[PDB]
Structure 1
């Protein structure tokens, strides 16, 4: 990622130091009024929200390089209360106060357009996700989430496309899919297993019929093709 590499140097030139975060640590949390611009440079995270009754929702994962905003650039107020939890072992994040972002970007438009590009990908990612997760009930939600996971963390193997995430549980899939009961997730995953769309080996999920997932997640496959052509081409 060339544009992300130059944006890293620029932040170090301007005195923003890398911060090391560890698995299960929260880079920010929904119970703290802190507005940031997190340039996640390396590692994997998940954006989560917890209800007043304990319902956990995984809004999405982020895999560096990428930008996550918790406050508005103009009003410096909160965009909404979320937690950014690290799920990889180590994560390298450049934490920026929202009150100093406007000046950092105005100075250098190349960097400003990089952050803007990142936000455009975020906008269209969420739209595609909303479409695919809505039109085919919970089957499409699971297939949509599996397709995302296959593209962003998958690697080709003879057993299929291995989703390389440590402890991807039925529970997590449920939190990413709006399914609170792990057993309800299993009922869908089990059906996908009998049709041999996926197999569970080596504590990992192997996707064996990608075309099946595409059929129940068409706008997400379209989005990866248009927005992440290199990610899409690795598995096609």
Structure 2
């Protein structure tokens, strides 16, 4: 990813070091009065909110490279009581105090813009998932999630397009699709195998009817085309 590498260089040039995190660590947390800008270079994370009673809500998933800001760039205060939890075995991130960020993102036009456009991608991402859920309900959500997986992590094999993720759980798939109970997920996963869309072999998921995912996640597919055309084009 060209413009991701250009942003890495900018940060290192200015004395910002990568940091390594392991699974289950919080890169930033909902109880901290200091807010940060996170340049997630490598790894997979999820945004969570933890209620008083202890229930954990999974709000959004990110893979490197991406930018996540826990505070507003102007006020430096929280945008919401959120944690950024590492769910891959390792992740690499640059961690910048918000105040320190402004002293930098100014002197440069191009790098301001890279972060700007990432927020734009994210705004449109949530709108597309909402549109698909409004039309096709939970099937839309799950199809969109599998579509994402296929575009980002798919490899061509004779058994179909193999999702090359190792730790992927039926539960983590539901949370990533906004469905919190394994009953709904297994029901819909059942139909998908039953309609020959997905198959499970060798601990991995293989997609065999990619057109079907596109049919039920059409606005997320649109989003992929418009925001990630290079990727999208691999399988279109």
Q: TM-score range by the shorter chain?
A: over 0.9
User: What is the aligned partner in structure 2 of residue 23 from structure 1?
Assistant: 23
| Residues in 2 aligned to 1:166 and 1:61: alpha-carbon distance in whole angstroms | 17
Q: Which has the higher mean CA deviation after the structures are superposed, 4-13 or 44-53?
A: 44-53
Deviation, structure 1 residue 54: 4.9
- The 1:124–1:229 alpha-carbon spacing in structure 2 relative to 1, beyond 3 Å, is same
Deviation, structure 1 residue 74: 0.3
Compute the TM-score of the two structures, normalised by the length of structure 1: 0.94
- The 1:226–1:53 alpha-carbon spacing in structure 2 relative to 1, beyond 3 Å, is same
- The 1:80–1:111 alpha-carbon spacing in structure 2 relative to 1, beyond 3 Å, is same
Q: RMSD of the TM alignment (CA)?
A: 1.6
Q: Which has the higher mean CA deviation after the structures are superposed, 201-210 or 174-183?
A: 174-183
- The 1:4–1:178 alpha-carbon spacing in structure 2 relative to 1, beyond 3 Å, is closer
Q: Which runs of 5+ in 2 are unaligned?
A: none
- The 1:56–1:165 alpha-carbon spacing in structure 2 relative to 1, beyond 3 Å, is farther
Deviation, structure 1 residue 96: 0.4
Conserved in 2, the CA contact under 8 Å of 1:134 and 1:141?
A: no
Deviation, structure 1 residue 29: 2.1
Deviation, structure 1 residue 135: 1.7
- The 1:163–1:10 alpha-carbon spacing in structure 2 relative to 1, beyond 3 Å, is same
Conserved in 2, the CA contact under 8 Å of 1:133 and 1:144?
A: no
- The 1:220–1:70 alpha-carbon spacing in structure 2 relative to 1, beyond 3 Å, is same
* Per-residue Cα deviation, 1:197-227 (whole angstroms, up to 9, x for no partner): 0011111111111111111100110111111
Say which SS state the counterpart of residue 211 (structure 1) adopts. helix
Deviation, structure 1 residue 53: 4.6
- The 1:233–1:147 alpha-carbon spacing in structure 2 relative to 1, beyond 3 Å, is same
Deviation, structure 1 residue 122: 1.2
Compute the TM-score of the two structures, normalised by the length of structure 2: 0.94
Deviation, structure 1 residue 195: 0.3
Say which SS state the counterpart of residue 149 (structure 1) adopts. helix
| Residues in 1 aligned to 2:73 and 2:109: alpha-carbon distance in whole angstroms | 15
* Per-residue Cα deviation, 1:157-187 (whole angstroms, up to 9, x for no partner): 2211222222221211221223222122101
Q: Which runs of 5+ in 1 are unaligned?
A: none
* Per-residue Cα deviation, 1:50-72 (whole angstroms, up to 9, x for no partner): 34455443333211111111111
User: What is the aligned partner in structure 2 of residue 91 from structure 1?
Assistant: 91
| Aligned residue-pair number | 236
